[PDB]
Amino acid sequence: SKKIKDPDAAKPEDWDERAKIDDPTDSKPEDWDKPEHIPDPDAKKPEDWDEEMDGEWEPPVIQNPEYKGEWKPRQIDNPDYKGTWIHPEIDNPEYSPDANI
């Protein structure tokens, strides 16, 4: 996604930045992580459209029934930490809106 943790952002080398840990001994795959938005399966476009002049159509999305806000397992408060200063995230180079960066 847009805006992620990165090296430009000038983080120290691992200074108990978390506050709340994730699955200690549990863990599962990523396969919770279903897409928030899926295109309409029956997303037909108008024949009254010129993608030459718009640039593309505009295929609608719906919210997926399986929608979880993110793979947050059980973010439990850790066994004592430091204090995440406020790292400035940066504009995730590997995001790519529609064309690879």
Instruction: Return the CATH number at 64.
Output: 2.10.250.10
Provide the experimental method for this PDB entry: NMR
State how far the Cα of 13 lies from the Cα of 11, in Å rounded to an integer: 7
* DSSP symbol at 4: B
For the residues of 58-92, what is the DSSP string, one character each? ---EEE-TT--SS-----EEPSS---------B--
State how far the Cα of 75 lies from the Cα of 20, in Å rounded to an integer: 5
Query: Domain total for the chain?
Result: 1
In which domain, by residue range, is 39 found?
Answer: 1-101
Which own/partner contact pairs does 35-39 have at CB distance under 8 Å and 24+ positions apart? 35/64, 36/63, 36/64, 36/67, 36/69, 37/61, 37/62, 37/63, 37/64, 38/62, 38/63, 38/64
